[PDB]
Design a protein around this ligand. Structure first.
Ligand SMILES: [Zn+2]
Ligand SMILES: [Zn+2]
Ligand SMILES: [Zn+2]
Lengths: 117, 376, 1178
RNA sequence: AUUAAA
């Protein structure tokens, strides 16, 4: 069984696999205000130059960010590519809890923000 | 002031969680062909896990008569709520208020999430595109704003010199129509923010506008008694028809997603339904609003069921083909109900009234004695 | 882009059943229908239902009824099809198919009243006196068909236009004992639902409208208006008592026109919900919400409750026949039923879509009745989930086969009838031993003094004799003509003697010793049946031999006028007297192309077919046919079949009676078998593993099986390649086995595997679980199946949220209270070696925890030489109502090898729960992506990395309302939403980002999602609530997709059934294509095979020709049936069931259609047979 | 950090 065993696709190079790798049919992002933070990382921008500064539909990311974005988890990240906080799901990178650090002990033990003591 | 930096005791909030209903429906669909194979939910409190969402009970739209009060969501600003809209996946409720702010309430536990000063003038219109990307809002100052799911304003332009009452998207969302107090409907190109046509002929304030689900038709309602309802061709800009449907001030025009029905609410205390294929004769007339009928909302799942709001605060429920109201709450709000929004699963209804609060209504639990203030 | 749909397994599951005169007025028949299937059953007296006729429709039956028309020899069948279609059909003598008398369409937009979505199935009802039939259409239009050219023009009644404004019709039944056809309608003028009962209680009403056929007037008589809100079906009481019995969920009502209503309360749940006067029925605490009932005799009703319990309800009456009381008797429980009908008195059929439909026999006890199961019709239930795995018992001789050896395990049934079905398409022999015997090409096994004593081999110039017994050894002793080849060898008489024929002559054997030998162009083919021996020379000379007791073979030259050369022969004995005019028959084919049947003791012609080789659909009395065989099969060899081999093409005929000539005709039966020293391809066998049938040799060996059920079964056997010759073999070392050669010259001594049943469309083993089977997953390592099962227990507590922790309210009610059913979920371990559950390997979940998903996931690990490890992952949710927040758990289990418990070899396998932790939301879907676990938790999709025993969050993305299904290929995830649509997601490893590539913007209630794989094209196959199959493609450069952010559907197909599970296999032109298989919720298995554009266009012209130029059952339109959701459209999927009609046509019809569509029959046949060949898996 | 605790 195990479809991966009987019906393997590793030897097949799919068209959409080429399309996403070559950023195929990616129209420039209209309305320079928006950000599209749920988009893929621009692989063209990683290698060298994309040629679309802010007009690219895909994320032009930077490695200096260390703390995860609290608004991105809530789905309200307005900054987008100009966001200083990491759009990753690393729990170690979570910001420290405002209430545990200052207001003694946090109300809910289920909060994702880091507790220091 | 409130800034998310104040300690308070942990609260376990009231929830209307649709997940148990969906899971139960996912199990039933496996072995039940349709409603006739569905085992009956008993009117007892112990049958809490047999409930399914409205998609499960397609043959009985009476489930979605949501007269069970859940929660009242009021801002600390305490200003009238003019428009309520659900985020397309039902994650959040967004309310547009007279202060011009957007307030976001969690779709499961209906508590405050965030607030943002969206418009300078009262928010009159709020609509999401057919693709879930875009939320278009208009204000009393005549400005139209473009938003996304992250509530980031992207584009701003002034569509009308007077108050914009309602906006409606085309099926492909490439174009939309706005109605204003200047008396004209205007067709816009979404991507270029350019007005394609100006639609003139009502002669008074245009209070509502709707786009046909598939055809490319625009229906408008106005204060003008001579031209209460008009049909337009958004490409040519021409007036296809005029419908003398109401005596006074058609407040809402909603085209059913089936593409056949026009639902009109007016200040003459009447909601009327029309077949757009045969406009000369009026279909069912809905009577039962003691005061003016101000808001209507077709159910997302049940195509014949819709909720209606009144200027007295009454929230009534109607079905196509049924003469009388299938349900209602005469004192749902203390003030005129401005907008009604259904959750994408039509199990929760939200109402924003001229009173400074917004309320959430869910389906009645099987086996409960509806002796509360809103029922008996 | 292009594909062809084929069904590999016909749907199983019956929704309608009735007892009517299908064939003639002398006997009644059990007529049952399912999803696009019609079955006619006879009752053979142990009692067994044997199939008499089966028909397929291009549409799903929505309602079934029968009427006896004026001056008719049969009952016409009234079949209803989705939307507004009524088709009146009869059985046709002559051509053994159905005959469409009238087809009615009521599909006008005016009748729909502006409601585009149809939620009401069309329901046909028949007057008891046969005066008229009524079909309720769209819930508002009542179509009336008057009966007396047997039909009068129909008219439509708008029930809204009637008095009292019905407006919500629950049930409608014609009433007995009226001068005019009186239709009782149960309806809700004002509708309510359980939950608003406090403000709207008594909502149901009945009206009896008297239908005047001529004046077309229909006044209302006998209105009642305060019936309980939860009134389910109503049933019309027969003539003596009359009236109607109304089933309610919690109460039972008897209503009559004059008598005041009589009603009883079935449980204490009627108290605050019904103001109707109800009297507590004593000793019964039941519910009638989803119950099937039928009247046995009068004043007695058998009711099949939900849960399967059977009750006998008695209407207790006074002398003047007024119902004054109800009597309830609880008889034995049985299957979950969808329909019920009474056969001959004492017999009751329980039609079942969930579990096996079974025939019951009830007898009065020594008022009360006892029920026993006499027969059961196998039902692969609603196929919730399916798992592919490899069978454990493949013989060592087939281990080096290049194609994978694999089977299907299906979660079937529901509740008490929940089961696992093990499905194998092909038969796999269990080889006992192999003999390397080259040169010999044909075999014969004969019984000697009922084991087979001798095995006779024919070589090119010699004959080899093997004495089979305790040891199989060659006999060099005399008796058998080993000098040259043998044409045929068999048993003559009653197995007392052995008959051996060579080109030189015919030899009679007592065993090892020869009794006598008779010398006799060389003999090329011999036919032996009973004391009759017929041999044919190369030039067509025919002589017959007869056993005359002294025994001895006696020469009797047949009187035959050779206007044409005889090219093949057959002998047949008719045990069951279908061959009316133990009798003996000779079947003969001439060179001109004529087929002749002869009374065998004499030689008078009885049957004649003018153009036999062309393959006519029906053979009626008055090229190069190679082999012909008549065999009687079934119970006591009742139903005979004709087997013909012409031009590398197999065509096989069923025989049916039809009135000094033979009162029989032959009907062509469809199949998908292609045939692309005279050696017989058809080898009749009796009692191979207790099975009687014929083995077809050749490039595609097949098993033809007909049991007492009477259904033709065709099972392929291709694991050993083409089979040259075949013979039955009953031996001490080979009990009721068989014998065949491989093409390499290997002789196989084999037996049929015992764990499978071959009386189904596929070899199947059904494992009863007595509980609902939700998900099944195959674990490659440890080679076991994990099954997520749930069982129902009474609910005793109502969870509450008090703001601090969960607070449980104990349900305190009366003794007459029906407790709600609460599901308890378990994950079990099933061994393929012995399909019993593995002991002490069972995971029990929490009290309210529901398995929402369970899959086998390959997660990367550093243990094996590869990366992936292959665990079993389950997603759960605690279902505690709307008021309580739903949260879930992710369970990752490994099946490990351990030393088995002494005396329990099955206990070598055991769960190892590596991860079981509470998640921050409901876990609704699970998947794996490049060694990472992908979970839909609430309105987000998370991607996890599995550490030693911890799950590490890698990335997430915000998703739609409720993701109930995810499947991944490479680094792409296809997520299905319950209401919104499918979504396409990609994960980038270098930057831990999960993004949305594209999605379908339109709403869609998706059932399940898979992939369509081409050489480079990837399609997202989607199942829908409206029973549609959609293929979506990611086309960023296409204009219709705005920037690639819209997924575009590129192929559309309406399968008649819901699909919840998908799996794909490689094709057996097809370099990188994968066949996507699916199991339907109606018990069927279907295919979606990718196709080239040119072949698609050719077969599309063929499909249009077959749609236009061929009559179809019930007059239905094949093209309209496969249209999208109309029961926009992108017709790029061919209907292989329609394309199979080309194979069913005669050669002349095929050629005419090919010239009309401007192509070659050879080209069309090549395309069709290639599609059949590449999909020969399982 | 844009109201994380409304
Ligand atoms: Zn870029
Ligand atoms: Zn951010
Ligand atoms: Zn904290």
């Amino acid at each position: 069984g195990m479809q991966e065993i009987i019906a393997s696709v590793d030897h097949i190079k799919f068209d959409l696999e080429i399309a996403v790798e070559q950023q195929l049919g990616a129209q420039p992002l209209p309305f320079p205000g928006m950000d599209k933070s749920g988009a893929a990382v621009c692989e063209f921008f990683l290698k060298a130059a994309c040629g679309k500064g802010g007009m690219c539909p895909f994320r032009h990311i930077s490695g200096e960010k260390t703390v995860v974005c609290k608004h991105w988890l809530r789905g309200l990240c307005k900054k987008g590519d100009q966001c200083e906080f990491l759009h990753e799901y690393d729990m170690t990178k979570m910001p420290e809890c405002y209430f545990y650090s200052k207001f003694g002990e946090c109300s809910n033990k289920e909060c994702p923000f880091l507790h220091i003591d | 002031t409130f800034d998310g930096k104040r300690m308070r005791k942990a609260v376990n909030r009231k929830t209307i969680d649709y997940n148990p209903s969906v899971i139960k429906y996912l199990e039933n669909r496996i072995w039940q062909r349709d409603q006739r194979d569905m085992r009956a939910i008993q009117p007892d409190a112990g049958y809490y896990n047999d409930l399914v969402p409205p998609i499960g009970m397609l043959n009985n739209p009476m489930n979605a008569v949501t007269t069970k009060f859940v929660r009242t969501s009021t801002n600390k600003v305490k200003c009238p709520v003019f428009v309520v809209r659900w985020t397309p996946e039902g994650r959040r409720l967004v309310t547009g208020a007279s202060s011009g702010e957007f307030t976001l309430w969690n779709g499961l536990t209906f508590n405050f999430e965030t607030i943002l000063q969206a418009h300078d003038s009262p928010v009159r219109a709020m609509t999401w595109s057919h693709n879930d990307m875009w939320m278009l809002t208009a204000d009393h100052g005549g400005y139209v704003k473009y938003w996304q799911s992250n509530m980031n304003n992207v584009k701003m332009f002034q569509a009308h010199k007077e108050a914009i009452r309602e906006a409606s998207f085309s099926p492909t969302d490439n174009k939309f129509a706005t109605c204003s107090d200047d008396g004209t409907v205007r067709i816009w190109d979404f991507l270029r923010c350019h007005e394609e046509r100006i639609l003139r002929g009502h002669g008074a304030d245009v209070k509502c506008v709707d786009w046909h689900p598939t055809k490319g038709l625009v229906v408008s309602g106005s204060k003008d008694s001579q031209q209460p309802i008009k049909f337009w061709d958004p490409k040519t800009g021409q007036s296809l028809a005029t419908l003398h449907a109401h005596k006074n001030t058609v407040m809402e025009v909603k085209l059913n997603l089936n593409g056949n029905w026009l639902l009109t609410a007016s200040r003459d205390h009447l909601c009327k339904l029309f077949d757009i294929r045969n406009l000369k004769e009026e279909l069912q007339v809905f009577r039962g609003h003691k005061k003016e009928a101000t808001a209507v909302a077709w159910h997302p799942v049940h195509e014949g069921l819709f909720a209606s709001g009144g200027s007295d605060g009454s929230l009534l429920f109607w079905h196509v083909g049924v003469e009388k109201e299938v349900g209602g709450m005469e004192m749902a709000h203390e003030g005129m109900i401005w907008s009604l929004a259904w959750h994408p699963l039509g199990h929760i209804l939200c109402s924003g009234s001229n009173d400074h609060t917004s309320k959430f209504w869910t389906r009645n639990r099987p086996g409960d004695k509806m002796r509360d203030r809103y029922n008996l | 882009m292009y594909a062809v749909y084929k069904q590999a397994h016909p749907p199983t599951g019956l929704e309608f059943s009735m007892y009517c005169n299908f064939f003639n007025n002398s006997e009644r028949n059990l007529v049952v229908a399912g999803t696009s299937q019609l079955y006619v059953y006879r009752l053979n007296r142990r009692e067994k239902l044997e199939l008499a006729a089966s028909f397929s429709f291009f549409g799903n039956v929505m309602s079934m009824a029968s009427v006896q028309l004026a001056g008719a020899k049969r009952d016409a069948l009234l079949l209803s099809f989705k939307d507004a279609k009524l088709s009146v059909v009869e059985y046709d003598p002559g051509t053994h198919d159905l005959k469409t008398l009238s087809l009615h369409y009521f599909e006008e937009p005016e009748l729909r009243d502006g409601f585009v979505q149809n939620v009401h199935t069309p329901r046909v009802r028949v007057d008891p006196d046969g005066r008229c039939a009524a079909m309720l259409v769209y819930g508002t239009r009542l179509v009336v068909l008057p009966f007396r050219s047997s039909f009068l023009p129909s008219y439509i009644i708008d029930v809204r236009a009637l008095d009292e404004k019905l407006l919500n019709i629950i049930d409608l039944q014609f009433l007995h004992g009226y001068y005019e056809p009186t239709l009782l309608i149960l309806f809700e003028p004002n509708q309510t639902w359980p939950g608003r009962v406090a403000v709207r209680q008594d909502t149901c009403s009945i009206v009896a409208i008297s239908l005047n056929i001529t004046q077309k007037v229909h006044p209302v008589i006998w209105s009642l208006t305060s019936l309980p809100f939860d009134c389910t079906q109503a049933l019309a009481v027969p003539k003596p008592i009359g009236g109607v019995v109304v089933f309610a969920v919690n109460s039972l009502l008897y209503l009559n026109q004059s008598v005041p209503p009589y009603g009883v309360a079935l449980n204490s749940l009627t108290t605050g919900t019904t103001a109707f006067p109800l009297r507590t029925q004593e000793g019964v605490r039941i519910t009638l919400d989803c119950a099937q009932a039928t009247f046995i005799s009068y004043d007695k009703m058998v009711i099949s409750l939900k849960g399967g319990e059977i009750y006998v309800l008695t209407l207790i009456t006074d002398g003047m026949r007024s119902v004054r009381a109800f009597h309830f008797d609880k008889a034995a429980a049985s299957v979950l039923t969808t329909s019920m009908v009474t056969m001959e008195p004492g017999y009751l059929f329980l039609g079942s879509r969930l579990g096996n439909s079974l025939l019951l026999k009830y007898t009065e006890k020594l008022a009360t009745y006892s029920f026993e199961v006499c027969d059961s019709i196998l039902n692969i239930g609603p196929c919730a989930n399916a798992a592919v795995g490899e069978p454990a018992f493949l013989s060592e001789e087939f281990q080096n086969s290049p194609e994978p050896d694999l089977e299907i395990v299906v979660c079937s049934g529901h509740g008490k009838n929940g089961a696992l079905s093990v499905l194998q398409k092909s038969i796999r022999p269990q080889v006992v031993t192999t003999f390397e015997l080259p040169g010999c090409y044909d075999m014969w096994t004969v019984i000697a003094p009922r084991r087979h004593g001798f095995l006779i081999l024919s070589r090119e110039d010699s004959t080899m004799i093997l004495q089979t017994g305790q040891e199989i050894m060659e006999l060099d002793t005399s008796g058998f003509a080993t000098q040259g080849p043998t044409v045929f060898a068999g048993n003559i008489g009653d197995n007392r003697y052995i008959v051996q024929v060579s080109p030189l002559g015919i030899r009679l054997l007592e065993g090892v010793n020869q009794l006598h030998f008779i010398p006799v162009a060389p003999i090329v083919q011999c036919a032996v049946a009973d004391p009759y021996v017929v041999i044919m020379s190369a030039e067509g000379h025919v002589t017959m031999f007869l056993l005359k007791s002294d025994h001895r073979l006696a020469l009797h030259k047949p009187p035959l006028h050779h206007q044409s050369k005889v090219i093949t022969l057959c002998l047949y004995r008719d045990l069951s007297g279908m061959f009316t005019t133990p009798t003996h028959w000779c079947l003969l084919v001439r060179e001109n192309g004529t087929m002749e049947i002869y009374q065998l003791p004499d030689w008078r012609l009885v049957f004649l077919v003018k153009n036999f080789p062309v393959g006519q659909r029906v053979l009626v009395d008055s090229p190069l046919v190679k082999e012909v065989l008549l065999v009687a099969l079934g119970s006591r060899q009742s139903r005979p079949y004709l087997l013909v081999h012409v031009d590398q093409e197999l065509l096989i005929y069923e025989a049916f009676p039809h009135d000094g000539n033979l009162k029989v005709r032959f009907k062509k039966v469809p199949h998908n078998i292609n045939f692309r020293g005279r050696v017989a391809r058809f080898r009749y066998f009796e009692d191979i593993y207790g099975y009687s049938g014929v083995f077809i040799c050749g490039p595609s060996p097949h098993w033809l099986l007909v049991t007492g059920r009477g259904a033709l079964r065709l099972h392929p056997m291709a694991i050993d390649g083409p089979v040259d010759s075949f013979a039955p073999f009953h031996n001490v070392n080979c009990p009721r086995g068989f014998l065949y050669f491989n093409r390499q010259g290997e002789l196989r001594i084999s037996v049929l595997p015992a764990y499978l049943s071959y009386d189904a469309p596929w070899p199947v083993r059904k494992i009863p679980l007595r509980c609902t089977a939700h998900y099944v997953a195959y674990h490659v390592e440890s080679k076991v199946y994990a099954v997520a099962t749930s069982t129902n227990t009474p609910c005793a507590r109502i969870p509450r949220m008090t703001g601090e922790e969960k607070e449980f309210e104990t349900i305190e009610r009366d003794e007459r209270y029906i407790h709600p059913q609460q599901e308890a979920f378990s994950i079990q371990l099933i061994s393929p070696v012995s399909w019993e559950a593995i002991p002490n390997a069972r995971i029990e979940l929490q009290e309210w925890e529901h398995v929402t998903c369970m899959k086998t996931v390959s997660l990367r690990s550093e243990e094996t030489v590869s990366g992936l490890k292959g665990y079993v992952a389950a997603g759960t949710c605690l279902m505690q109502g709307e008021e309580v927040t739903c949260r879930g758990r992710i369970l990752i289990m490994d099946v490990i090898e351990v030393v088995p418990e002494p005396g329990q070899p099955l206990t070598k396998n055991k769960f190892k729960v590596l991860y079981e932790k509470e998640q921050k939301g409901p876990v609704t879907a699970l998947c794996h992506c490049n060694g990472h676990l992908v979970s839909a938790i609430g309105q987000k999709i998370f991607l996890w990395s599995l550490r030693a025993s911890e799950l590490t969050g890698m990335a997430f993305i915000d998703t739609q309302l409720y993701i109930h299904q995810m499947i991944s290929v490479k680094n792409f995830i296809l997520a299905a939403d319950v209401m919104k649509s499918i979504s396409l997601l990609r994960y980038q490893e270098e930057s831990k980002t999960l993004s949305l590539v594209s999605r379908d913007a339109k709403p869609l209630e998706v059932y399940s999602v898979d992939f369509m794989v081409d050489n480079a094209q990837l399609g997202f196959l989607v199942s829908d609530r409206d029973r549609n199959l959609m293929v979506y493609m990611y086309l960023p450069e296409a204009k219709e997709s705005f920037g690639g952010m819209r997924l575009l559907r590129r192929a559309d197909f309406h399968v008649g059934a819901h699909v919840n599970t998908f799996w794909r296999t490689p094709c057996r032109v097809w370099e990188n294509k994968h066949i996507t298989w699916f199991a339907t919720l109606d018990g069927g298995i279907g295919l979606l095979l990718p196709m080239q554009e040119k072949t698609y266009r050719r077969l599309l012209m063929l499909q249009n020709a077959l749609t236009t130029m061929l009559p179809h059952h019930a007059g239905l339109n094949p093209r309209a049936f496969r249209m999208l959701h109309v029961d926009n459209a992108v017709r790029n999927v061919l209907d292989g069931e329609l394309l199979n009609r080309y194979l069913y046509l005669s050669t002349m019809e095929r050629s005419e259609l090919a010239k009309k569509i401007g192509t070659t029959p050879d080209i069309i046949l090549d395309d069709l047979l290639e599609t059949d060949r590449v999909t020969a898996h399982f």
